[PDB]
mmCIF file of C-alpha atoms in Angstrom:
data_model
loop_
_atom_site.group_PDB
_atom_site.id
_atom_site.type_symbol
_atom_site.label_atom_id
_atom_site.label_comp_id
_atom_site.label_asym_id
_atom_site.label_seq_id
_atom_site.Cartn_x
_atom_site.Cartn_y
_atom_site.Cartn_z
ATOM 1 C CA UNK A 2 -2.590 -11.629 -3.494
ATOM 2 C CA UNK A 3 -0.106 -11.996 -6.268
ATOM 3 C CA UNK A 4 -1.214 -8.159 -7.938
ATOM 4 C CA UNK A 5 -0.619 -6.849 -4.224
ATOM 5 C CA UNK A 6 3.186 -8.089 -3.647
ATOM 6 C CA UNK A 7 3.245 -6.584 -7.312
ATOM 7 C CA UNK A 8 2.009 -3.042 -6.677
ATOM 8 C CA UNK A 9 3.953 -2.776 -3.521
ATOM 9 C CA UNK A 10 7.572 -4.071 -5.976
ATOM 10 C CA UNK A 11 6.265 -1.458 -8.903
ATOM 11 C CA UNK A 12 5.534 1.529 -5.858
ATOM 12 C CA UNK A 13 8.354 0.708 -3.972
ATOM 13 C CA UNK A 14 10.599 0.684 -7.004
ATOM 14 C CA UNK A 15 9.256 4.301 -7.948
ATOM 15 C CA UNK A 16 8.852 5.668 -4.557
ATOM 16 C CA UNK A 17 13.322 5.122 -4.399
ATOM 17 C CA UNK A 18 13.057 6.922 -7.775
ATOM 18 C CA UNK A 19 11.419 9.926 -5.998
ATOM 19 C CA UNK A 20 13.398 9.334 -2.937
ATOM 20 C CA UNK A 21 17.253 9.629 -5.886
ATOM 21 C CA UNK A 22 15.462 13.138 -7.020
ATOM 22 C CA UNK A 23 15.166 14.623 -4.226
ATOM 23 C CA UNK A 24 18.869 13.750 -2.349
ATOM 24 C CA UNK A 25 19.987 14.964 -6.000
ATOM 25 C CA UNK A 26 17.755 18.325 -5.141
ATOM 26 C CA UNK A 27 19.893 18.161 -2.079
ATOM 27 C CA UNK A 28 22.982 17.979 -3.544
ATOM 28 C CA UNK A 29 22.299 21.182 -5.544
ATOM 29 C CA UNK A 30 21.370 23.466 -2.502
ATOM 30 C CA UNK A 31 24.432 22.293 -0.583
ATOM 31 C CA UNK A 32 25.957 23.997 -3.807
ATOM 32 C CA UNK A 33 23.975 26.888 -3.884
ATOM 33 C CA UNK A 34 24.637 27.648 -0.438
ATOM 34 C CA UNK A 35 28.327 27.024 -0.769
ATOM 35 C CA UNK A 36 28.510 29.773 -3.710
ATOM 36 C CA UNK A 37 26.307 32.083 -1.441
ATOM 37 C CA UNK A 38 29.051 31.675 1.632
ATOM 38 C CA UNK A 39 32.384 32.092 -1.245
ATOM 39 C CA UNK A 40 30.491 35.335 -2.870
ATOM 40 C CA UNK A 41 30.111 36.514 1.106
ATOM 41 C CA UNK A 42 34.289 35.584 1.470
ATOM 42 C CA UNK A 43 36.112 36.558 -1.650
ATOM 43 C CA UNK B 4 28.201 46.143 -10.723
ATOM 44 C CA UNK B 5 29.151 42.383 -10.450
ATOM 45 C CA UNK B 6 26.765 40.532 -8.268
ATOM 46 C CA UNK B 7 25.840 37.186 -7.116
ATOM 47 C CA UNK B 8 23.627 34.215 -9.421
ATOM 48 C CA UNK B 9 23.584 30.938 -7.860
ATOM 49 C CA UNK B 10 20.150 30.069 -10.317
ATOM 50 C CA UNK B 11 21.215 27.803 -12.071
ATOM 51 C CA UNK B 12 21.920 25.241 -8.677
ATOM 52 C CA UNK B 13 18.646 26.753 -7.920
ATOM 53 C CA UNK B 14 16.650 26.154 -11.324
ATOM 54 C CA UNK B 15 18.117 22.695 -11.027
ATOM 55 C CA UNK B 16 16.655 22.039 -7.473
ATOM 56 C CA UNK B 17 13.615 23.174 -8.585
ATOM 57 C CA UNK B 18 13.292 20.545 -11.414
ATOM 58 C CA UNK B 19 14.346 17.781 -9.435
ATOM 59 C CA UNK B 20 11.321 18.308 -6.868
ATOM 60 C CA UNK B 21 9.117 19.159 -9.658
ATOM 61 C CA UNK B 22 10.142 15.266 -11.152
ATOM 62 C CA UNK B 23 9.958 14.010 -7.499
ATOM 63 C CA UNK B 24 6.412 15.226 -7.041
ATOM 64 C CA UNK B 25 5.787 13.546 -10.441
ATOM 65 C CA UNK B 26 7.448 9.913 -9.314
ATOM 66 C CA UNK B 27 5.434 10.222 -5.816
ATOM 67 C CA UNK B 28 1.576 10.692 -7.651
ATOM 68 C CA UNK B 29 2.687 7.969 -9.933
ATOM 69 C CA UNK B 30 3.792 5.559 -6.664
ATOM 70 C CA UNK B 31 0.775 6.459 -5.321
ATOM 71 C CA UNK B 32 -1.321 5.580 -8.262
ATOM 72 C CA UNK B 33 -0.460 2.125 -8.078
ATOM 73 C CA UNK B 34 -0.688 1.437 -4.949
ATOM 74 C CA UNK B 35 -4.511 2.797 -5.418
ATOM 75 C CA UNK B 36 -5.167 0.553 -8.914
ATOM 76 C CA UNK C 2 0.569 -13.806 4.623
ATOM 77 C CA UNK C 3 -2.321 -11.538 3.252
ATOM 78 C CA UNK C 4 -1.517 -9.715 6.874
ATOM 79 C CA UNK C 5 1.751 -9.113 6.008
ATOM 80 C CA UNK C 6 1.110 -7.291 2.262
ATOM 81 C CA UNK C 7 -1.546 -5.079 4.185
ATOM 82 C CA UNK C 8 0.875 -3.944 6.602
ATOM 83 C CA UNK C 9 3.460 -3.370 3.716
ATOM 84 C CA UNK C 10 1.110 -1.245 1.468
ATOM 85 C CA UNK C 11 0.520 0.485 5.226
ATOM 86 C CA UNK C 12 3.985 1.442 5.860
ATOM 87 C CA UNK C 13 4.604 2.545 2.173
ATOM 88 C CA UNK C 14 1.911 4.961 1.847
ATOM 89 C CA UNK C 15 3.096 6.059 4.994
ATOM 90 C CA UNK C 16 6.268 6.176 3.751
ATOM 91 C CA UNK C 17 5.522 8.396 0.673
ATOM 92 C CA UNK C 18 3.465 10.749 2.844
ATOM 93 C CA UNK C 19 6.948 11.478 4.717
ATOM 94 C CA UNK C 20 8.996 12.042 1.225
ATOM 95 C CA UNK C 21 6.266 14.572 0.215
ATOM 96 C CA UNK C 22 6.725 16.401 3.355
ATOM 97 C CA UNK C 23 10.382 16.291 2.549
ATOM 98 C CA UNK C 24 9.868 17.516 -0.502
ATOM 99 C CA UNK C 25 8.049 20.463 0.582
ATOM 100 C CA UNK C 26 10.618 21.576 2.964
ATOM 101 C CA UNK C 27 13.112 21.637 -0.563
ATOM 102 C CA UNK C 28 10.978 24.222 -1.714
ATOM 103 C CA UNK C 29 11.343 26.366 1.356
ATOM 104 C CA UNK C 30 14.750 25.691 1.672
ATOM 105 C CA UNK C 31 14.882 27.182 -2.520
ATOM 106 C CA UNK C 32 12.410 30.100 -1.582
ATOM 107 C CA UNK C 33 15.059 31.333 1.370
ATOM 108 C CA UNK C 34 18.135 30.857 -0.532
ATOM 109 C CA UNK C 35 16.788 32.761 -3.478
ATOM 110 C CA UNK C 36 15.794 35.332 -0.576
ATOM 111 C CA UNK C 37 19.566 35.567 0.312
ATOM 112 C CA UNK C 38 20.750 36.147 -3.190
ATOM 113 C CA UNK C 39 17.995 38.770 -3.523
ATOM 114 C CA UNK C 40 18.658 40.656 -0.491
ATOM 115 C CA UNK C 41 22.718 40.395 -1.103
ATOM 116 C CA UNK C 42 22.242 41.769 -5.028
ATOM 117 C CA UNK C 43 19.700 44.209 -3.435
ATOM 118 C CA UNK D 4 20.620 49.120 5.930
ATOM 119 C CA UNK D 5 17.949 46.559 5.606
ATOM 120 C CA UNK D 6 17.675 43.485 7.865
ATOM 121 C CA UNK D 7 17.625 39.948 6.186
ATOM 122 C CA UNK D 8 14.406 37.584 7.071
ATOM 123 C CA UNK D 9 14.114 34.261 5.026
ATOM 124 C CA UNK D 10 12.426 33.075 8.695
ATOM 125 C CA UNK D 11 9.084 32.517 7.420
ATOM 126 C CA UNK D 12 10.674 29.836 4.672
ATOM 127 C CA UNK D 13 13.314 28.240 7.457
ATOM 128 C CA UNK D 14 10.640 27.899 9.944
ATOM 129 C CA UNK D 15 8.181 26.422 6.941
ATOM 130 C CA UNK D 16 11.114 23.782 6.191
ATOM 131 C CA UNK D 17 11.488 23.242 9.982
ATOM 132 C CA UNK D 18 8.019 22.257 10.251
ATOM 133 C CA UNK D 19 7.935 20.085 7.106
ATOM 134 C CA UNK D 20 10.684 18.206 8.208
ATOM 135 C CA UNK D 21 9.044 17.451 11.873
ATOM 136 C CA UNK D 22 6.055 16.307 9.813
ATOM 137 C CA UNK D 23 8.271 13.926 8.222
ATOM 138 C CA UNK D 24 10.292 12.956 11.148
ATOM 139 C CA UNK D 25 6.910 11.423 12.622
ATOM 140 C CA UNK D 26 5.387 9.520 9.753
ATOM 141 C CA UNK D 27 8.607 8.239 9.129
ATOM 142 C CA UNK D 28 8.662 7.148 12.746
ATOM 143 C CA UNK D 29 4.852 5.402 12.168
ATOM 144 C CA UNK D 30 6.410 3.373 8.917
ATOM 145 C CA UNK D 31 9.117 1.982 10.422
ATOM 146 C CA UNK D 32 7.074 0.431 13.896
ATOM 147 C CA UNK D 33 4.357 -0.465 11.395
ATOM 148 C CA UNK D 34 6.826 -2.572 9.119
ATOM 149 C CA UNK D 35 8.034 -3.847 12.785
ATOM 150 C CA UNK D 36 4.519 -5.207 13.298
ATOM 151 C CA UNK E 2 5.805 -15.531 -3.008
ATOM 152 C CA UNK E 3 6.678 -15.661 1.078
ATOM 153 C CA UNK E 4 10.299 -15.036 -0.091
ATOM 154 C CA UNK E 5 8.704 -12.051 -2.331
ATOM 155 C CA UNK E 6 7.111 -10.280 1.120
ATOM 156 C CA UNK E 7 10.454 -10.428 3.250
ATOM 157 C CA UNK E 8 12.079 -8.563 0.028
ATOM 158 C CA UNK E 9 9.896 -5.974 -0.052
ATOM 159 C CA UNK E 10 10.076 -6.060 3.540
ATOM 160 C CA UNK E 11 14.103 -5.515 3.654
ATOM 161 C CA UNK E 12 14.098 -3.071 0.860
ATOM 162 C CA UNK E 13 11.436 -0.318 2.109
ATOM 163 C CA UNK E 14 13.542 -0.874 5.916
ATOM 164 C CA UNK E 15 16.312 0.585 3.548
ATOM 165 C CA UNK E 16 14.397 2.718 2.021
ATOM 166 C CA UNK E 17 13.027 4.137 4.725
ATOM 167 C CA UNK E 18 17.063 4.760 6.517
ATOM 168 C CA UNK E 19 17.743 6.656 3.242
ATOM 169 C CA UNK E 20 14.711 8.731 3.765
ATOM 170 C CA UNK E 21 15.565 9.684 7.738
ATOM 171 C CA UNK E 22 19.523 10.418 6.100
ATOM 172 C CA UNK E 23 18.036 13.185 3.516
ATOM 173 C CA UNK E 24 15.736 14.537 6.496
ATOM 174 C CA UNK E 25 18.690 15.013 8.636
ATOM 175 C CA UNK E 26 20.557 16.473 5.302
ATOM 176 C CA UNK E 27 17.384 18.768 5.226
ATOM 177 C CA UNK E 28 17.814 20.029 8.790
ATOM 178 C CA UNK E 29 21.607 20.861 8.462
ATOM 179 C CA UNK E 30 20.615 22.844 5.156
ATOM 180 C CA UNK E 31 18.437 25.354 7.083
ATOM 181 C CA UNK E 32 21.036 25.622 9.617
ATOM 182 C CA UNK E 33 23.585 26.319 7.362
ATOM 183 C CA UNK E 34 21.050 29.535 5.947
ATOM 184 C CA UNK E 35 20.143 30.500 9.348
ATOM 185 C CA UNK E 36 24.124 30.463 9.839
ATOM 186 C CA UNK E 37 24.554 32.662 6.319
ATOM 187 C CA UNK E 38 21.585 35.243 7.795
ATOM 188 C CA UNK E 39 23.045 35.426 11.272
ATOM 189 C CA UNK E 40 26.030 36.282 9.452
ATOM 190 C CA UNK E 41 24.702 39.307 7.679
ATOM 191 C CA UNK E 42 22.794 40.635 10.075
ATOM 192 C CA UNK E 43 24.900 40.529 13.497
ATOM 193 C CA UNK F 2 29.962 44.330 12.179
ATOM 194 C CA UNK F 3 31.699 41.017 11.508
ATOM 195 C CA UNK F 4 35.939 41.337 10.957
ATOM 196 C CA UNK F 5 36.051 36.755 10.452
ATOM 197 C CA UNK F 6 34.898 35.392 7.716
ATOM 198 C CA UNK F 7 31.260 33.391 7.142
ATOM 199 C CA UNK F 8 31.836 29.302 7.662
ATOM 200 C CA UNK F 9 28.564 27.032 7.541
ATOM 201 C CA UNK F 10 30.927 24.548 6.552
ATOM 202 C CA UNK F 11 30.507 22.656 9.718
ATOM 203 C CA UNK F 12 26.362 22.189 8.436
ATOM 204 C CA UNK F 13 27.329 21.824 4.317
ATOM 205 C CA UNK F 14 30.066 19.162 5.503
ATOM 206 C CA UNK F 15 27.055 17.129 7.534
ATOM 207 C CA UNK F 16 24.584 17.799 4.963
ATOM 208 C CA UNK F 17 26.851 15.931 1.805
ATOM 209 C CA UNK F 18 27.884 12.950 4.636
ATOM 210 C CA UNK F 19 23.853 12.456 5.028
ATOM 211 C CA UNK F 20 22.879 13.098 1.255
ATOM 212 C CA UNK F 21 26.094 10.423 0.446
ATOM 213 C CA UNK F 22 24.952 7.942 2.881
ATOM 214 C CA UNK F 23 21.354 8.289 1.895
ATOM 215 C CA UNK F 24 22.792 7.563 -1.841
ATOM 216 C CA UNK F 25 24.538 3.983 -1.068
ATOM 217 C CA UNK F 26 21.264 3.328 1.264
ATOM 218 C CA UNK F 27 19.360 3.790 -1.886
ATOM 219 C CA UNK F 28 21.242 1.691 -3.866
ATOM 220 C CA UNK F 29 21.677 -0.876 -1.223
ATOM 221 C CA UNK F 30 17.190 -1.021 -1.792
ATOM 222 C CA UNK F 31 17.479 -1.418 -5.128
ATOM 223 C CA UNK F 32 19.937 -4.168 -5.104
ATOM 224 C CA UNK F 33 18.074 -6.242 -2.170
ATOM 225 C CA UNK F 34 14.295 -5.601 -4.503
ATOM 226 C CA UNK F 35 16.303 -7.071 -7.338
ATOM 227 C CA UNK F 36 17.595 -10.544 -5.439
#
């Protein structure tokens, strides 16, 4: 099935999306944690 | 009294997960159609 | 290979059932640091 | 002096992530198959 | 499209190693809090 | 009663190698769903 190899290209292709949002959710908790520890320190 | 406000790292967390839950139903949904 | 779509659209829904869990543990991971900041201004 | 417990949402995560840690396991020996 | 399945095929392998790299991101983030608590507290 | 100071650095340091990794992984999909 043609439509099947094209659901799986449109999910997959969406799913990464999802995948970039989260890492970038990531990215702001490693900050927020960092600003927790340097308000601790100083 | 200063004190500590890491929201706004926080608030932005929070909106990427809300747009990741939003990306996720939509994969989902065409898998399903 | 009809056998291998089905085991594609297998793995991916799999797949996306792991990146909601992932997501889930984000929140928790916001709901404790939030804690820390609370406790610390408290 | 008040003890700090954000062990309810750590051991939440903790979970979450094991939960992910196995379906990510079944993807990748499906896609094998 | 044969050449369309081992894409899809390669890509969500990928995908999936991204998604183990933010899990093990994830578990290093709740250490680092557990750290910040154990910190406080003792 | 703690005299040194707090350092999860050893965690936040492992945490941005994964989330970078993860990034170029990511991109790496994208690039082999395009070709």
């Amino acid at each position: 099935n043609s439509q099947a190899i094209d659901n799986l290209r449109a999910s997959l292709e969406t799913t990464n999306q999802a995948i970039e949002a989260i890492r970038q959710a990531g990215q702001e908790m490693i900050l927020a944690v960092q600003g927790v520890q340097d308000y601790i320190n100083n | 009294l200063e004190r500590l406000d890491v929201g706004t790292n926080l608030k932005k967390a929070e909106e990427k997960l809300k747009k990741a839950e939003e990306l996720l139903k939509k994969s989902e949904e065409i898998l399903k159609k």
